[PDB]
Amino acid sequence: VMTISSLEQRTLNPDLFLYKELVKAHLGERAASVIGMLVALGRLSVRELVEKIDGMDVDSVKTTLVSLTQLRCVKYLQETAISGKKTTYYYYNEEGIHILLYSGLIIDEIITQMRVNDEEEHKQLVAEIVQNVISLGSLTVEDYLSSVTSDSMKYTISSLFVQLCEMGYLIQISKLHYTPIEDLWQFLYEKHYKNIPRNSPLSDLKKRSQAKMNAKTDFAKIINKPNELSQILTVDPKTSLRIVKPTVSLTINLDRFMKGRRSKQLINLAKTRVGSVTAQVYKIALRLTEQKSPKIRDPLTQTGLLQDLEEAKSFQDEAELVEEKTPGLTFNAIDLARHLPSASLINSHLKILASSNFPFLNETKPGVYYVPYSKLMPVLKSSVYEYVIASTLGPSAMRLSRCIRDNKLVSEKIINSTALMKEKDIRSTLASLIRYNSVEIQEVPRTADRSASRAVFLFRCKETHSYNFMRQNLEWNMANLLFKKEKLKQENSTLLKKANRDDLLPSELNQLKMVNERELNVFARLSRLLSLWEVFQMA
Amino acid sequence: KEVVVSETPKRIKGLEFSALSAADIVAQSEVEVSTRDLFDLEKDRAPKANGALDPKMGVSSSSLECATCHGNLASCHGHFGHLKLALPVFHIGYFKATIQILQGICKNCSAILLSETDKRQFLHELRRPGVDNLRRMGILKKILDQCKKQRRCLHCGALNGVVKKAAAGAGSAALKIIHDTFRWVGKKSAPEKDIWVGEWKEVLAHNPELERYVKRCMDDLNPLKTLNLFKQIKSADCELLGIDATVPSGRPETYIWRYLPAPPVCIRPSVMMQDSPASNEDDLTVKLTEIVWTSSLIKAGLDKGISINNMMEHWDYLQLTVAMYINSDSVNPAMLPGSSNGGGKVKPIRGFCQRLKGKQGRFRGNLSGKRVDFSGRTVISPDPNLSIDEVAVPDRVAKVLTYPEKVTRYNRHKLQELIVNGPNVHPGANYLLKRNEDARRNLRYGDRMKLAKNLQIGDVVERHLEDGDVVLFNRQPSLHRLSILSHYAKIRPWRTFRLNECVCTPYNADFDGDEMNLHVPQTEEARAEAINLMGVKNNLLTPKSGEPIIAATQDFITGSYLISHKDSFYDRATLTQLLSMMSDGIEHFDIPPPAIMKPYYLWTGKQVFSLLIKPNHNSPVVINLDAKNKVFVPPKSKSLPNEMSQNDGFVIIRGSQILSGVMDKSVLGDGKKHSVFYTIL
Amino acid sequence: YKGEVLGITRFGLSKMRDSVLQLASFEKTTDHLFDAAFYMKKDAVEGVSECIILGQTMSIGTGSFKVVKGTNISEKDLVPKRCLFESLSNEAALKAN
Amino acid sequence: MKVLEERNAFLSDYEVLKFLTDLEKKHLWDQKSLAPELQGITRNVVNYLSINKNFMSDESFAELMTKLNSFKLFKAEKLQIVNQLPANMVHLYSIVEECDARFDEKTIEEMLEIISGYA
Amino acid sequence: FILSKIADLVRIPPDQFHRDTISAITHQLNNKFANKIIPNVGLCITIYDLLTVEEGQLKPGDGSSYINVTFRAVVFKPFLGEIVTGWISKCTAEGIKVSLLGIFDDIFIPQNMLFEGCYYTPEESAWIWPKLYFDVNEKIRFRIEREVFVDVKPKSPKEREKPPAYALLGSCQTDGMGLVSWWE
Amino acid sequence: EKAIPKDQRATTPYMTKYERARILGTRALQISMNAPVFVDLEGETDPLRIAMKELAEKKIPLVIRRYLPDGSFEDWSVEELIV
Amino acid sequence: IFVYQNNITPSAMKLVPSIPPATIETFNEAALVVNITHHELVPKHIRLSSDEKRELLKRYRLKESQLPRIQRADPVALYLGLKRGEVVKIIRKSETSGRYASYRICM
Amino acid sequence: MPVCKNCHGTEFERDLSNANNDLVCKACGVVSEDNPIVSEVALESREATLNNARRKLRAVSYALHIPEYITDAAFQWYKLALANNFVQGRRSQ
Amino acid sequence: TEGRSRDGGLRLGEMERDCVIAYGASQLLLERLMISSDAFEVDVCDKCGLMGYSGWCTTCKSAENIIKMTIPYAAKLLFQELLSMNIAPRLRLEDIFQQ
Ligand SMILES: [Zn+2]
Ligand SMILES: [Zn+2]
Ligand SMILES: [Zn+2]
Ligand SMILES: [Zn+2]
């Protein structure tokens, strides 16, 4: 009704509804629509496209597709049929635009490397470096400086020459790299059940468990090959110092982005539970551990390979033990004075790890100071939600639902009896709760067979849905607003491309503040939003 | 000015069948029903501001306009209404398929349970161009079943459960659904067994009463639970579950009611006040107009107060109600009643889905069976003197039974005069229509005369049913192809349908006291169609055995026999008046030579009835046929032609004179492939 | 016709025959209808029985063919005529470019 | 119904209005014929198209292009020169690209003498 | 002005079956076009020539034949920057609405390129310049630039006018413009 | 897909029998709308019977199109075809 | 090719279709004692060259599918050992019209 | 109420004679319509007590065999005094 | 309206109707269950095919794509009933002429 509730534009498109405006506002034109139809139906053939999209065959297709390529917007799967010839199938590259839709928070990634040049044009220089790379995706040092002016100082333009490596940066597209995960576990899943040295005519089990291992153990160095390889990092040319390989285009990984950004929210987490000085302490403890921490690099085997009520719960234990020991070598044992602005004697003040206690960190090797990591993230993941509803919906809504976390499948008097509020409220807030999941309401027949009035009721949590219903939060404003931005453009569109290509009138001067302050609302708005949105989509 | 309007004749091809978006529904209709019925009765009977019945929504009687498109019944085609509904509400129509749409996906992390290339396998299968509506059914069946055998989801790691359609047949839980944690195996322990008994631990620890009493109830899904549950069910499967996701169908989050289309008033009018203050209700109006109530309860209640306990059954009473609202389910499952009840269980509750289901209605008793206009009904009575293929329609219906006509040229002189006779006297018109397509002019007001002089070329006027008009003619118990025929129209006095007898047997008409029905086409092409195709003379043979079904019947049969009879003889005067009586006046003849001469030159019935076939020297019919009549009497077997027996034999005709034998069914009597009439044709 | 023995009853009719409204001309038009729009069938208007519902022409019989009338036309007069406004001024855009 | 070619043949009037007078001789031939409503624009068609010619010819169409084929006028004003602004002074220069600019004296002059061949 | 290749369908009524084909065709397209305007392209006058006539198809109810042909039609398409005769009809201070007789007044030239020095009077003059005013019905050379096609038929039970579907705009950036005797 | 040349013709020379149907219905339906008739027309009238009287003269201009299932089109003039 | 003796396990039929480039023929003998092909009712069936197909379809100006079909694993179909899209010309002999023929296809 | 589209006749006579049922003004000769459409074949504070009101009324009413009619008439009077709240504090009889 | 009494009109049912098929007559149907049963037009929209009226498709504020055409008013009734419940037989259209 009058479009302002926007029901169509806000009524039936979860998920992809994000993406189509991502590219539309972003790339758009004919280039946009194809991506949605992809994510709509998924698995797709080039010939299969224009049978439906009506995207003006092989013109846009070949154009749009390679457009996606340079920005790696879509999964690229190439293979051959069994009879012969060739066939290709394409999915959406990871979440693709996910890289993009973070954008300036990746500018904040530089704020980690903000050190060594502080409040500089060099800051904005290396910023131009980065954003240019992001825009063009994979870049070579040689082609970059080639495009850049020559005959200047190699270790000056962005000085990032040597700092190209560090922690984040890139990593070349290699085979499986932007190729679908599940798919590449099927391709790599070959060569084992494919290569069977004729053990026994029956019982694949003996052949299975080993080959799975063979699939598992090979997959390790398969995904670690891209993880780090120094034959890039090696180059130490003459009249110069060691650089990565200038020849090859590599590409930003969101790994350092994963931990780096979440770590801030963790500094916020303890920053509640702990004190300011202790807070900043743990904050600086993060600097080294954010390097090798897998973090949301976790899912890995989560997809495409057989799980088990045994081996998934059994083989996942491995993740829980792994970082606590062997990468624990990389992790905190005894560290000395990262920076400091506390002062005077630092050493017993370093025992401040001990104060950090609960319900996280504070697990070490017995008699050195160490923070649990491998299980830290998981026990952390469980914690993250909590206050989400607090002044969102109701103060008391928390404590009861919080209580609903500890207790399980009881009833209302038993709720009325456990804490506080009267029925007029407890019904209200709990009815207010249900008005948005967070319930999974049990019931059992009482003095009836299956019916309503006679029966009795029970209440639980099921954090699955909990750590799951918030994804429409992304659908919430995030795409919708993104519209509300690009919904405004057409208003000033008569001015916009005029005003931009120009660099006049009183009302133009007036509406500049309206649209620009409007921008301050729309984007930094998301800066709030996404910061929240980070959690549930990851572990 | 005036942008050129280019409009094109366009005919239907195909029907796209799909669900309704939450958007499109409300995107269309005018008003949220909101309110209640109440008709807010003040200063008026049903002034009804907003409410289930709104003037802008649609009209019932002919009084007030429709607002949106005014002009009352003469205009508005109706408009929907839309409904805000507290909580989602389940659906009875899509129920048993919604089972499946819930089934094939893991109840926890909501992803299609079958995976990898086998997913791709079925996909690539369904995209082979040879897809059939069958292959839709059967193929999607044989991908579906793969669900039930899969114990555990891929990424969630949790087990699954099968939904058995909770309880059975009572209608109360027929909406409710239950899956479980199944194949516990009782020995090998899934971790969710420890988690589950650990769930029951605390109320065990608390109120150790009902737990072990009623138990193993497992879990259900609330329509709310499944609503949000679908909102992680995305893309991917789609047609794997049977739905293409282009746009609107935006994934099977449509199939549960989040908003309710309200039927336009024009569909189901409250029967008018009909002399007095008695105002007849209509069930849909009443039922949904309570659905308002049961909603608004859960609106304002549940906005602050009430209980989880008092909630679900209200909420349940909702889905049960709307369930009934469309369709049947359980009729009287000992519920106890609601508002506007009486508790007598009248019966009269269904009839929206049942509206288009059986007997006389929308199924195939009203629409496929449409009731017809321009017709009449009477009883039967003979006129042999009436030619075959003309019903003689009693003029007294012809006065009121019209035909449309477009005047020009040839027409005027008839029509222009045919008007001035006015409606009452027979050869005339009643309604007249100008070229200006305004409405039409009955002759009631007056005029003609001067108004008849107008008579432009583009003019349309109705006639009575006159000589040489076109009719089709029916008997109700219609067995087959012959159950309709079509005739030219002649007019006579008295009052009844009168036809010629030889076409009785096609109607299987007994005369006696039975009925018929009378139709006339309207457009010209229909006439030329039925008259020159579906009329008599072309249709004369039955399709089944390819015999002429029409023939002499009863008298005419035996009536021939007496003239046919050998022992008879006639006189030149006798034969004269006979041959007259055979064909009224008119047709010339040439007297064949006398049969026998010297004792008075007699003639023979064989000869006269022979002339019946070939009246004249210029008559262009020649026939030779021989055949077996019935009661065939063997000759002496030495005599080769069955022609000569002791009595008759083969009838035989060579050169189109009857040679020998009585006729008597057989030759003219239907019954057999060989027939005099069949041969002539 | 299709693979084997069937026909004539609600199962049997439901076989190949793809027009679902005429499958509602028969029996069980509830779960037929709902069932259809579920699968999002494309269907078509084809069967003669189906045709009279939507009321357009029959597909057989009298309607077994479209019908045309004689144009009695000569393509000769179809030849255009102009003094070629295009041709005269063409040579001003030809040079110096 | 769909336009197959919108921009097809750039058409001024030379014989155009004349052939409209031809179809007019075919249909109703204006007012003087005494010795459908479509006629309404026909006057509006001819009206100013006529009067500025007063305040015509045929072969001047052929005579038009002759020397005009040598110019930079493209097709735009090159058709527009036929009627509006009788090829004189700043009028002709006021429109087309580089109408004087590069090519000046005899180029803008011939327009005055060539239009005297007609207007 | 220009010529165009366009296609459409024609319903030939029965009465004309005596008459020659093209004439009935002609007469029809006339009644369909004539004084009318054709959207997002221009406003025809009559059809000029005709071609590709085909076998006439037919539908059962009407019985009148239908023939869908294409043809090049007499249409009106001025180019953008142009100087041409016209004059004020119904105008305001800012800008004027120039008119050629009997065609339409819909063209309204605003004032942007129109000379900066000007003064408006409610009497007889739009803007007089330091050269002067202009008259109705007088030959007035004005320039146009942009045309806008607005179809915009919100025909509704709600609304049951604003028909400037074909609208032009311009101003006077050089001399002799708005009064022809400045030049000449 | 397109038209079949008059050279190659596969079907009866005989009437459809629905030729006699729609050819007539069409024809007379025209006549109602006042198109000139090509036959000797005696003092009689009606929009059908005069068409009947015509067709024996084979004067009807009409031409039947015939679609095979493949959409091969087809054409026969009424006068071309034989009773 | 081979045949069941008596017992039929679905365990062997779990995966019957082992080898694409070759194929299998699997019967139980009980169904084959007197050859159905030779019996009475079954008219005579003739497999046709895959090229002859195209000729046939062009005679009636027809595409594939849209034809009288035969359910895969019909015994008679199995008797010829049909594969996907094989077409058979069938002469049914009865005196009504007389001897005549038709066509069907594996489906 | 309406008036002819042309003759401006306001007086409409509906001929039922021939069973067309067509309404035309004697001033024009044009019907303004074709084929007139015709028909075919408790939770409240007050209203529950109103069902009580007729109930007790209708009950005690015709024990005297007073007109079914007049009872209906008096009911609306009970609603009248009910509006005035005359019905509040006194014996219902 | 039904039967005798109230007023006239008669009953052509299924079994009777199917007869006129076997004569192959189309136009007897197009007159019969179409013109003289319910003679009715519906305003429909190519885009998002539904049934509007006058100048609107009303799901899309439109005033354009409508095509005035004829259908049995019984048929419209059938749609609106359906679409009053949840289901949509959105229509597809085609040129009657041009092959
Ligand atoms: Zn309305
Ligand atoms: Zn799962
Ligand atoms: Zn009147
Ligand atoms: Zn639409």
Q: Please enumerate in sequence order all residues whose Cβ is within 8 A of that of I29, keeping only pairs 6 or more positions apart, or say none.
A: C52, C58, I20
**Residue listed under structure tokens 């070619």:** D5
- Calculate how close chain C gets to I55, using CA atoms only, in Å: 23
Ligand of minimum distance to the alpha carbon of B64: 1
Ligand 2 ion: Cβ-proximal residues, 5 Å cutoff: B 106, 108-109, 153, 156
Tell me if residue H39 falls in helix, strand or coil: coil
What amino acid occupies position C80?
A: P
Question: How deeply is B667 buried, as exposed, middle or buried, from its count of CB atoms within 10 A (0-12, 13-18, 19+)?
Answer: buried
- Residues 6 or more apart whose Cβ sits within 8 Å of residue D111: D81, D87, D88, D92
d(CA D102, CA C95): 14
F1-83 falls under which CATH superfamily?
A: RNA polymerase subunit, RPB6/omega (3.90.940.10)
Give, in degrees to the nearest 5, the angle at Cα B646 between B640 and B651: 65
Identify which of F23, F17, F19, F14 has the alpha carbon closest to the alpha carbon of residue F48. F23
Look at residue A61 and give its three-state secondary structure: helix
The two tokens of residue D35 are: 């010795």
> What one-character-per-residue DSSP string does A71-89 give?
TT-EEEEEE--SSSS-EEE
Question: In terms of Cα–Cα distance, which of G73, C15, G83, G107 is closest to C5?
Answer: C15
User: Which chains border C (3 or more CB–CB pairs < 8 Å)?
Assistant: B, D, E, F, G, I
Q: Does E56 touch chain F (CB under 8 A)?
A: no
Considering only the beta carbons, identify the residue of I17, I49, I86 that sits closest to B16: I49
Residues A66-72: contacts with CB under 8 Å, at least 24 apart: A67/A27, A67/A31, A68/A35, A68/A93, A70/A136, A70/A137, A70/A138, A71/A96, A71/A100, A71/A136, A71/A137, A72/A96, A72/A137, A72/A138, A72/A173, A72/A178, A72/A251
For every residue of C3-19, DSSP letters joined together read SSS--SSHHHHTTS---
Helix axes B555-564, B605-613, angle to 10 degrees: 130
Which chains does chain G touch, 3 or more C-beta pairs < 8 A? C, F
| G 55-74: CB under 8 A from C | 68-71
Instruction: Kindly report each contact of residues G3-6 with a partner whose C-beta sits within 8 Å and lies 24 or more positions away, as own/partner.
Output: G3/G27, G3/G28, G3/G29, G3/G32, G4/G28, G4/G29, G5/G29, G6/G30
d(CA A244, CA G2): 66
According to DSSP, the β-strands at E147-149 and E166-168 are antiparallel
Q: Is the dihedral of CA G80, G82, G88, G94 positive or negative?
A: positive
In 3-state terms chain C splits into helix, strand, coil percentages (rounded to 5) of: 45, 5, 55
| DSSP assignment letter at A180 | -
Whether omega for the bond prior to residue A359 falls within 30 degrees of 0, making it cis, is yes
**CA B394 to CA A201: how far, in whole Å?**
94
Rg of chain C taking only CA atoms, in angstroms? 28
What's at B239, amino acid-wise?
Answer: E
- CA angle at residue B53 from B51 to B56, to 5 degrees? 100
- Give F22's contacts in chain B (Cβ within 8 Å): 525, 529
Please give, rounded to a whole number of angstroms, the shortest distance from the CA of A139 to a CA of chain B.
33
Q: Taking a contact as any Cβ pair under 8 Å apart, which residues of chain I between 33 and 52 contact chain B?
A: 33, 35-38, 42, 48-51
DSSP B270: P
Q: What is the DSSP string of B298-319?
A: HHHTTTS---HHHHHHHHHHHH
Rounded distance between C-alpha atoms, residue E52 and residue C78, angstroms: 7
For B470, name the nearest residue in chain F, comparing CA atoms only: F48
Cross-chain Cβ contact I25/F21 below 8 Å: yes
Q: Which two tokens stand for residue B225?
A: 């639970």
Helix (H) or strand (E) holding B68: none
CATH topology for G35-107 is Eukaryotic RPB6 RNA polymerase subunit (3.90.940)
Tokens of B646: 């002791």
Q: Supply φ then ψ for residue C16, to 5 degrees.
A: -115, -50
Q: Do chains G and H touch (3 or more CB pairs under 8 A)?
A: no
What are the backbone angles phi and psi of residue B524, rounded to the nearest 5°? -60, -50
Nearest chain D residue to E2 by CA distance is D11
φ and ψ of A58, to 5 deg? 65, -15
User: For strand B484-492 and strand B390-394, is the pairing parallel, antiparallel, or unpaired?
Assistant: parallel
Q: Which of chain E's residues have a Cβ under 8 Å away from the Cβ of D9?
A: 2-4, 72
Q: State how far the Cα of B398 lies from the Cα of H61, in Å rounded to an integer.
A: 59
**G91 - beta bridge partners?**
G44, G101
Are B531 and F19 in contact by the 8 Å Cβ rule? The answer is no
Please indicate whether, in this complex, the C-beta atoms of B524 and F28 are within 8 angstroms of each other.
yes
Structure tokens at A321: 């033990």
Q: Return the structure tokens found at B647.
A: 């009595």
Query: Letter for the amino acid at A467?
Result: Y
- Structural domains of chain E sorted by starting position, each given as residue range(s) with its CATH number in brackets: 1-76 (3.30.1490.120), 82-182 (2.40.50.140)
Three-state secondary structure readout of A293-352: CCHHHCCHHHCCCCCCCCHHHHHCHHHHHHHHHCHHHCCCCCCCCCCCCCCCCCCHHHHH
* CB pair distance less than 8 Å for I84 and B77: no
Q: Are B478 and B369 in contact (CB under 8 A)?
A: no
Strand G26-28 and strand I51-52: pairing?
Answer: unpaired
Binding partners of B (≥3 Cβ pairs within 8 A): A, C, E, F, H, I
Q: Which of residues 100-139 of E touch D (CB under 8 A)?
A: 100-103, 139
List Cβ neighbours of I92 (8 Å cut-off, separation of 6 or more): B12, B13, B14, B15, B16, I49
- Residue E73 bridge partners (DSSP): E4, E47
CB–CB of A163/A113 below 8 Å? yes
Compute the half-sphere exposure of residue A171: CA atoms within 13 Å on the CB side of its CA: 21
Residue in E12, E55, E62 to test binding to C, most C beta-carbons within 10 Å:
E55
Q: Tell how far CA E44 is from the center of its chain.
A: 8
SS3 A130: helix
Q: Which of the ligands is closest to the CA of residue B70?
A: 1
H17-46 in b/e form (b: 16+ CB < 10 A) is: eeebebebbebbbbbbbeeeeeeeeeeeee
Question: How is residue G71 written in tokens?
Answer: 């359910």
Can you spell out the DSSP letters for B438-450? SS-B-SSS---HH
Using a CB-CB cut-off of 8 Å, the residues of chain F touching C69 are: 61-63
Pairwise CA distance, residues B592 & B603, whole Å: 9
User: Where along chain F do its domains lie?
Assistant: 1-83
Cβ pairs bridging F and I (under 8 Å) = 6
Contact B670, B548 (CB under 8 A): yes
Distance separating alpha carbons of residues B527 and F22, to the nearest angstrom = 10
Closest alpha carbon within chain B to A467 = B109
CA count, 13 A, side-chain hemisphere, B334: 3
Cα–Cα distances (Å) from A341 to A277, A495, C37, in that order, read 11, 49, 69
What's the 3-state SS for chain G? CEEECCCCCHHHHHCCCCCCCCCCCEEEHHHCCCCHHHCCCCCEEEECCHHHHHHHHHHCCCCCCCCCEECCCCHHHHHHCCCCCCEEEEEECCCCCCCEEEEEEEC
Which of F29, F36, F63 is nearest residue E63 as measured by Cβ atoms?
F29
CA distance A144 to A133: 9
Per the CB < 8 A criterion, the answer to whether B573 and B551 are in contact is: no
Tally: H helices and E strands in chain D: 6, 1
CA dihedral H27, H33, H37, H38 (to 10 degrees): 10
Residues with CB under 5 A from ligand 3 (ion): H 4, 7, 9, 25, 28
- Say how far apart CA E165 and CA A205 lie, in whole Å: 78
Helix (H, G, I), strand (E, B) or coil at B487: strand
Length of chain B: 681
Ligand nearest to the CA of H7: 3
Strand partners, G100: G92
Q: CA A130, CA A142: separation in Å to the nearest integer?
A: 15
User: Torsions phi, psi of E57, nearest 5?
Assistant: -85, 175
Degrees, nearest 5: CA angle H73-H78-H82: 145
Q: Is I60 annotated as a binding residue?
A: yes
If DSSP codes are grouped into helix, strand and coil, which group holds residue D78?
helix
Chain-chain contact of C3 with G70 (C-beta, under 8 angstroms): yes
* Centre of ligand 4 from the C-alpha of residue B511, in Å: 57
Q: Which residues of I touch B353 (CB under 8 A)?
A: 85
**Distance (Å) from CA E157 to ligand 1 centroid:** 9
Contact partners of D by the rule of 3+ C-beta pairs under 8 A?
C, E
Whether H43 contacts chain B with CB within 8 A: yes
Give the residue among B9, B8, B76, I65 at the shortest CA–CA distance from E155.
Answer: I65
- Cα A530 versus chain centre, distance: 10
Please give the backbone phi and psi of residue I51, each rounded to the nearest 5 degrees, phi first.
-115, 110
Output b/e per residue, H60-90; b: 16+ Cβ within 10 A. ebeeeeeeeeebeeebeebeeebeeeeeeee
* Gap between the Cα atoms of B188 and H31, Å rounded: 86
Distance between CA atoms of residues F48 and B531, nearest Å: 10
Q: Which residues of H touch B397 (CB under 8 A)?
A: none
Walk me through the domains of chain B, giving residue ranges and CATH numbers: 1-91+242-359 (no CATH), 92-241 (no CATH), 360-401+464-547 (2.40.40.20), 402-463 (3.30.1490.180), 548-681 (no CATH)
- Quote the tokens at residue A319: 């993740």
Please give the full DSSP string across chain F, using - where no structure is assigned: --PPPTTS--S-SS--SSIIIIIHHHHHHHHHT-----S---S---TTHHHHHHHTT----EEEE---TT----EEETTTS--
Give me the residue label for tokens 């030329």.
B528
Contact call for H and E: 3+ CB–CB distances under 8 Å:
no
Task: Give the alpha-carbon dihedral of F21, F23, F24, F25, to 10 degrees.
Answer: 80
* H12 CA to centre of ligand 3 in angstroms: 8
Q: How far is E57 from chain I (nearest CA, A)?
A: 6
Residue G71 to chain C, least CA–CA distance (Å) = 5
Residue type, A493: S
Task: Say if residues B305 and A428 touch (Cβ distance below 8 Å).
Answer: yes
CA distance E1 to E73: 10
Contacts of E17 in chain F (CB under 8 A): 30, 35-36
Contact residues, chain D, for E175 at CB < 8 Å: 90
Instruction: Retrieve residue G66's tokens.
Output: 């849209």
Q: Are B517 and B376 contacting, i.e. CB atoms less than 8 angstroms apart? A: yes
Task: Report residue B47 CA to chain centroid gap.
Answer: 37
Residue E17 corresponds to which amino acid? F
Q: Pick from E7, E73, E23, E84: which is nearest to E45 by CA?
A: E73
Please write down the long-range contacts of A153-158, taking CB distance under 8 Å and 24 or more positions apart: A154/A240, A157/A125, A157/A129, A158/A122, A158/A125, A158/A126, A158/A129
Largest CA distance in chain C: 82
Q: At what angle do helices A60-70 and A29-41 cross, to 10 degrees?
A: 80
Method: cryo-EM
Name the CA radius of gyration of chain F, rounded: 14
Shortest Cα distance, chain B CAs vs residue E163, angstroms: 7
Phi, psi of A314 (to 5 degrees): -85, -50
Residue A43 at interface with chain B, using a CB cutoff of 8 Å: yes
Is the sign of the CA dihedral F50, F56, F57, F59 positive or negative?
Answer: positive
User: Kindly report the CA angle at H68 between H67 and H72, in degrees rounded to 5?
Assistant: 115
What span, in angstroms and rounded, lies between the C-alpha atoms of D13 and E3? 11
β pairing state of B10-18 and I88-95: antiparallel
- Nearest-10 crossing angle of helices D16-26, D39-54: 130
Amino acid of residue B168:
A
Task: Look up tokens 């002859």; give the residue.
Answer: G52
CA of B117 to the centre of ligand 2 (A): 18
* Cβ separation I27–F18 shorter than 8 A: no
Using the mean position of ligand 2's atoms as its centre, give its distance from the Cα of residue B146 in Å. Answer: 15
CA of B77 to the centre of ligand 1 (A): 6
Secondary structure of residue A474 in the 3-state scheme: helix
Q: Round to the nearest angstrom and report the end-to-end CA distance of chain E.
A: 25
Cα(A410) to ligand 1 centroid in Å equals: 53
Pick from C94, H5, D86, H45: which is nearest to B439 by CA?
A: H5
Yes or no: say if A403 and A410 are a contact pair by the CB < 8 Å rule. no
Inter-chain contacts counted by CB atoms under 8 A, chains B and C = 70
Query: Quick check: E4 and D89 CB within 8 A?
Result: no
